[PDB]
């Protein structure tokens, strides 16, 4: 993010980080279940990448994390690589994450409901604070 | 580097697709959602990231971080994949595995 602030650590129970195996964070994601996850499709997630949860910093010599192995990528049928419409993906995990004070799940909308303009929402992540 | 080791938070407005075409036009789909242009933007490293809004107090996943200004400029709205338009498959997916 550009122009954010340090959230409260574990302030966001649901936030994951996505590492490849050069052990590097490439994309964000959200925990729906103990078993399941949601991310973006343009992220090019494979069975070979990792989900990290209940983390804070990446400098950690070690934090009390959860390095979780992927099972099956559930890509979206409709991801359009020029459009970027239907930019979604799902992750089933070899193992579940255990819900603590820090790790937990985001609630879901329905296609029925309205989240009207002018509404104050939030966004989190380890993206660039400066371009 | 412009890399945060620690997790960054941000807070922002929701835009009408009508309001968002003012910037993007032809590019907005029935399937996206715009937010920000209020002096913030997701940048690189953020994509796949959440977008939440509080409802009956519980925090709901409104949108996913897609794409945006070439420069992550703070005057430009960020585009997010609209969850509203994607859930039934999520629910249909988790319905089977």
């Amino acid at each position: 993010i550009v122009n954010g602030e340090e959230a409260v650590p574990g302030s966001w129970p649901w936030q994951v980080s996505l590492q490849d195996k050069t052990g590097f964070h490439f994309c964000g994601g959200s925990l729906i279940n103990e078993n399941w996850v949601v991310t973006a499709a343009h992220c090019g997630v494979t069975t070979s990448d990792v989900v990290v949860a209940g983390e804070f910093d990446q400098g950690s010599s070690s934090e009390k994390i959860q390095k979780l192995k992927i099972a099956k990528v559930f890509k979206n049928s409709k991801y359009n690589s020029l459009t970027i419409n239907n930019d979604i993906t799902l992750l089933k995990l070899s193992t579940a994450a255990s819900f603590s004070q820090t790790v937990s799940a985001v609630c879901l909308p329905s296609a029925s409901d309205d989240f009207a303009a002018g509404t104050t929402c939030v966004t989190t992540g380890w993206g660039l604070t400066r371009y | 580097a412009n890399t945060p080791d620690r997790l960054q938070q941000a807070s922002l407005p929701l835009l009408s697709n009508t309001n968002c075409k003012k910037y993007w036009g032809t590019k907005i789909k029935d399937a996206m959602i715009c937010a920000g242009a209020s002096g913030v933007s997701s940048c690189m490293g953020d994509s796949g990231g959440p977008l939440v809004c509080k409802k009956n107090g519980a925090w709901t996943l409104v949108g996913i971080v897609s794409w945006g200004s070439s420069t992550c400029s703070t005057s430009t709205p960020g585009v997010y994949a609209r969850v509203t338009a994607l859930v039934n498959w999520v629910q249909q997916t988790l319905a089977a595995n």
Binding site: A7, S11, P13, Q101, S104, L108 | W59, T60
Partner: peptide, 8 residues
């Protein structure tokens, strides 16, 4: 669901 123990 969507209640952090740690309140943000």
């Amino acid at each position: 669901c969507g209640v952090p123990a740690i309140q943000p």
